[PDB]
Amino acid sequence: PTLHTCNKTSFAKAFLPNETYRQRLLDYIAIIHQLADHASHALKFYILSTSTSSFPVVHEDTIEAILYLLNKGEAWHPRKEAKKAWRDCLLPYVQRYCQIVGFIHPNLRGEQQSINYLTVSMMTNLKVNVQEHFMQMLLRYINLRFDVKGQKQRLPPKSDARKAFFTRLRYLKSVFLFDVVPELEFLDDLTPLESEVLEEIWSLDLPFLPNDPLAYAIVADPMSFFPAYCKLSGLYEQYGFQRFSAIPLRRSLIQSHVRIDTIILYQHILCITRRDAETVEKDDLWMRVCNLCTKAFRSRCGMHFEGSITTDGASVSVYLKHPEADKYKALYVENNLPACRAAENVVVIDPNKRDILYCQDSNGTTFRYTANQRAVETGSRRFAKRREAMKEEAGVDLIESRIPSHKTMNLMDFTRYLLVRRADWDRRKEFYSHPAHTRWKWHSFINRQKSESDLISNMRNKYGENFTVVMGDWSDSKTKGWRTLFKRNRIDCFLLDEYKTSSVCPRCSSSEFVEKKFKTRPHSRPWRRREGKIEKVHGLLGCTNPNCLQQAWTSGMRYWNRDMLSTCNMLLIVRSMLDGHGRPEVFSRS
DNA sequence: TACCCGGGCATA
DNA sequence: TTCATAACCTATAGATATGCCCGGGTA
RNA sequence: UCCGAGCCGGUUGUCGCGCGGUUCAAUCCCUGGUGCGGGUGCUAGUACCGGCUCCGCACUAUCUAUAGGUUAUGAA
Ligand SMILES: [Mg+2]
Ligand SMILES: [Mg+2]
Ligand SMILES: [Zn+2]
Incomplete structure (x- = not known):
């Protein structure tokens, strides 16, 4: 919310030149990145393996147990019964995944803070993905099954007699989404394709709420829809449609930003005992490793440092936290x-x-x-070209281009993807370990x-x-x-509003004489240009009303830039609104 | 044998 | 028309710390 | 698969003008900017007061991960 802000500075300026602390930070962030990546992959593997019986109820505890098993393995000894049950259920699958990928347990000490942060982030990613795109993917599947993309070409466009199908669809969705309870007589009117789609949607076991629509139900408890979402992905893979990332895998090999709080300096960087560290003020303890006198750490709008940063080896984002933090058409x-x-x-x-x-x-x-x-x-284009040159020189393109899709919902395909990723993990890890990426x-x-x-x-x-x-x-x-x-x-x-702002001449206020796309020229894009395509000019417009013309012109029309016309018409609209006359009639919708 | 500190785990 | 790796835009959610138990060494 | 920004024309308030002429900005290294004092220096005419560069006081700037569309690249 408004109670937090961030200031991003360079790694060199943020930290003192003590090399030991910098090396410890760099080592810790690398371990955390691998832990997060393998935890996400193991979660996906466990979901696919359990697909044989039923998709499990994934909570923070599941990801936390996966992380602990990866870091410690059998050495993890949770006290509460729920975490112990999760450990017992996940240990075989985690060990199998480690065998598949050859993962070696890092046995990192003092992982509580990082594990908590990673678990929260992964659960947030799952919730956001499902909530935002379950409806989109369901409607996309509905459209794809009925060939709505091709139905426009099959039927003559813009004809009332052919509007039936596009209306029929609108009704079918209402039945499929449980938005409207269908009448019993309608159930017998479904064509075989409609019946098949209805059965497929029924097989998803979508939750439902009687008092509020499906959209409200998704927002109320999005995670409850996760078991169905995965199923939906499988349906795509059955029909060969373009797949989607059902589970948010954390695949990037570039060093991701890792959070560092007072506890991480407590334990890993300063390596001071908790008892000794409790006797020192937070500000001084942070000053022992950080130059808090730097500009980035100054207070703004009453906010203060409060010991929280995120580092990736090249840039440090320092978070300023307000004292009142939680601590656990207006724009027109x-x-x-x-x-x-x-x-x-x-x-x-x-x-x-x-x-x-x-x-x-x-x-x-x-x-x-x-x-x-x-x-x-x-510098986006220069950096992109340099990255492409680096990839070509290193030959990493041939490795990445052949990686099997990670969006598959079949256990065999996911295992093949994991094996392929492991096969060339060492080369790509070294390639992306170069300082070029974070510096870029x-x-x-x-x-x-x-x-x-x-x-x-x-x-x-x-x-x-x-x-x-x-x-x-x-x-x-x-x-x-x-x-x-x-x-x-x-x-x-x-x-x-931009409605028809690009189709009126300000000097005659008449839209009847506006010319559009009156000239053509070879396509500007070189690849289309060599292809022999011709482009109509969009940003050039013409006025034909005699009042705007002159006898000295052989062109027969007054030329105008599209952006110039848009800005002039918008200025006229603003003047009219400020004058109390409101939006001009010519630009008004109806 | 029994005491102490340092570290691991739980959770709002 | 399908896949993979950067990134560019848009949108979501989250942005630590104190107490209790155990285990390892020492008396 | 390439494209910086301003000015004068062909021009009329004209183009992803692959039209011409014309002016300075960046191509590596760099968290960005605003207001107040001096502190060597480099620049224009006899303390006046334009710029570049630092020192120091407060004033200010939201990052991380994931997913969708697209772009660029490499495979079919
Ligand atoms: Mg517009
Ligand atoms: Mg425009
Ligand atoms: Zn006109």
């Missing part, structure tokens, strides 16, 4: 008109795929922030900060010290993140 300009009138200057912004921002003012001054500029400043991430962060700061500085220099931002509500290229950026710089941002 229509509703914000009163605030707009007090702005010194008003900026109207149109987003586009290429021109990420196209900004204009009432005084006519224009500005833009394009995709190419963002790519160049951020840190440099990308710095470049993004620089680019955003330069953008804000240029906007202030062109449009004044303070101004209000009005942006279109279109979204697909950065689309919705900008709303946050202006907030970080204390610049107001408001939304505006």
